[PDB]
Design a protein around this ligand. Structure first.
Ligand SMILES: CN(C)c1ccc(O)c2c1C[C@H]1C[C@H]3[C@H](N(C)C)C(O)=C(C(N)=O)C(=O)[C@@]3(O)C(O)=C1C2=O
Lengths: 293, 290
C-alpha cells in the first residue's frame, strides 16, 4: 500500500502563525489556505466565534513562513472552516491542481507536517464514519491524489478526536462528517470495514495468482449483506457492485461469487496463510487503486 | 500509521537509463547517474553474464539517460560492484545534501517506486532478517534534517514475490546475485527488537492490558521466542531499548516477560494499538520519532 510521491505538495507547505498558535498552510498561487482555528488560543477552542475573532484581525496579525522567507499577507477571507490568506508572492512551485470532495471509502495520501515542516507521508482512507486513523501540531496537513501531474486536494486536517482519530474538511472548508472546529466532546460513531475495498483487494489477489480462498458457492446480495453486517462490514450496494464490474470482467469471477469467498473468509479466518502477503484483510484499497496498479 | 519520509528530495534525482533492450531507473547525483549494472544485459545475457566483457564493449553513446524532458550527455562510465556509474556533463541542480550508508537487517527505510524514470509511489519497509524487502533502480532512503541517506537500490525480483538489492556502493544485501538463476528466499523471522519497541509504543500510549508482573532472563526468553520463529535478542538490541525503558519505567527483561506471555497465551481477542497482530517494522528509533 503506497502513497503518492509527495514532492509536488511539499513545495506548497508553509508555516502560519497568529500570536500564540502555529499550523501548516497550503500555499497555492498567491493564496495560503489553512484551518481557521489558527486564530484560536487553546482556551478559545471551547466556544469560538470565528466571525468575531476574524474582524478583529489585520494582515499584519498573520505570520506566514515559507522555509525562512517570510511572506507578506495583503488580504484575508474565510470560507466555512478554512482561512484564506492572500500573499503578495505567487508560489513558484505551484503544481497544476484541483479541489475535490471525496466519498467515504476513497483513498488518498496525507503529508504530515509539523510547524510547516514536512515530516512524513501515508496512504489512508476516508473511514465510513468520516474519520482518518492517522498519526498526528499536524493541523493543516493535507490529503491528496495525483492524476499524471494534476494534484487533487481532498482533505485538510483540523481536529484530533478523543477516540484518537482525526477529522477534517475538504478544501472548501466543509467538514467530512458531522464534526465542528470546536473542542467539545464529539462522538466518532462506530466504524465499519469498507466492504467494496476488501472485495477489490481480493480481486487483486486473484489477478496476482492467489486462488486459495475461492469457493464453489455464490450468494444473493441480501444474504451477503446480512452475514457481513454481523462482522461489522458496510452494506454493499448495487453501485459498489458496478464498480467491481471492471475487475469481475478481468478475472471472470462474478461479484456475488467473490462475495461468497468473503463470506467464508470471515467465517474461517486465514489458517496461517496470507493474501497478497498479508495475514489481515485490507480495506484501504479501492477498486480504482487496483485498476491503477 | 507507519509513515514514509517525504519523497520530494529523491524525486528530483530520478532519471531513466537505457542501454539497448533494457530501461530502468537511475539516481542522478551531482554529475553522476547511478543505476543497476544489469541494465547492460539483454534478457539473453542474464543467464551467465560477464559484466567486465559487456562493459568494455560499451561506449558513452550506447547509454541513453533521460531526465524528464532533457537527454543528458554521458562522458564516462565505470562500474562499482553491482552498480553502474555514468558521468554526465551536467551536475543535477536538484541535488540534495546526501550520504550513502549501509543498513543492518531490522532497520527501516522509505522506498520510492519508479517506472521508467517516473515516480509512482512511496512506502515504508524494513530490511527483513533474510535481507529481502516485501521497478529496478528504485531507491530506498532515510532523511535526517535535510540529509538524505541512500541505503538501497532495487535489482532483483525473487520468485517468492519479494525484492533484493544493493547499497549504493553496489554491494548486495544478503547472498543474492545479479544473474537470472533461481534464488532461494531463505525463511524469514520476526524482528524481535522492533516488536519490543512497538510494545513500548503501546504502553506510552494507552494500551496497558498486556503488562505483567513476572520477569525473565535473556536466555529463557530467547529459547521461548526462537520457538515461535523470532530473532535472537542481543545486548545491543537491549541497549537501544534503554532509551524507551527509561521513559516508561519498564525494565527491558520485564517487557520481555510481557512478550513471552503474548506468544504463549495469545491476545484473548484483545488488540494492541488497535491491531490484532504484532508489528515488527518499527525500530526503537522509529518509535522515538513517533
Ligand atoms: C475469524 N474468526 C475465526 C471468526 C469466525 C466466526 C465468526 O462468527 C467470527 C470470527 C471472528 C470475529 C471477529 C470480529 C470482527 N472482525 C474484526 C472483522 C469485528 O470487527 C467485530 C466487531 N463487533 O467489531 C466482531 O464482532 C467479531 O468479533 C466477529 O463478529 C467475529 C465473528 O463473528
Amino acid at each position: 500500500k503506497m502513497a503518492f510521491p509527495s514532492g509536488k505538495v511539499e513545495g506548497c507547505m508553509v508555516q502560519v502563525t497568529c500570536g500564540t498558535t502555529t499550523l501548516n498552510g497550503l500555499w497555492l498561487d498567491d493564496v495560503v489556505y489553512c484551518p481557521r482555528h489558527v486564530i484560536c488560543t487553546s482556551e478559545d477552542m471551547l466556544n469560538p466565534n470565528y466571525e468575531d475573532l476574524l474582524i478583529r484581525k489585520s494582515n499584519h496579525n498573520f505570520l506566514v513562513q515559507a522555509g525562512n522567507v517570510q511572506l507578506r499577507v495583503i488580504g484575508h477571507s474565510m470560507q466555512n472552516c478554512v482561512l484564506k490568506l492572500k500573499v503578495d508572492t505567487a508560489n513558484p512551485k505551484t503544481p497544476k491542481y484541483k479541489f475535490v470532495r471525496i466519498q467515504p471509502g476513497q483513498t488518498f495520501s496525507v503529508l504530515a507536517c509539523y510547524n510547516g515542516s514536512p515530516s512524513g507521508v501515508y496512504q489512508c482512507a476516508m473511514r465510513p464514519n468520516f474519520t482518518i486513523k492517522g498519526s498526528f501540531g499536524s493541523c493543516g496537513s493535507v490529503g491528496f491524489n495525483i492524476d499524471y501531474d494534476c494534484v487533487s486536494f481532498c482533505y485538510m486536517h483540523h481536529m484530533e478526536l478523543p477516540t484518537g482519530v482525526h477529522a477534517g474538511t475538504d478544501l472548501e472548508g466543509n467538514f467530512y462528517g458531522p464534526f465542528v472546529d470546536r473542542q467539545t466532546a464529539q462522538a466518532a460513531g462506530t466504524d465499519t470495514t469498507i466492504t467494496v475495498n476488501v472485495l477489490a483487494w481480493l480481486y487483486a489477489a486473484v489477478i496476482n495468482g492467489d486462488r486459495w480462498f475461492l469457493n464453489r458457492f455464490t450468494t444473493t446480495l441480501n444474504d451477503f449483506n446480512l452475514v457481513a453486517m454481523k462482522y461489522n462490514y458496510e452494506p454493499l450496494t448495487q453501485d459498489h457492485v458496478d464498480i467491481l464490474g471492471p475487475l469481475s470482467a478481468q478475472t471472470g469471477i462474478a461479484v456475488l461469487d467473490m462475495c461468497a469467498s468473503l463470506k467464508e473468509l470471515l467465517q474461517n479466518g486465514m489458517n496461517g496463510r496470507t493474501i497478497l502477503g498479508s495475514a489481515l484483510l485490507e480495506d484501504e484499497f479501492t477498486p480504482f487503486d487496483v485498476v491503477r496498479q
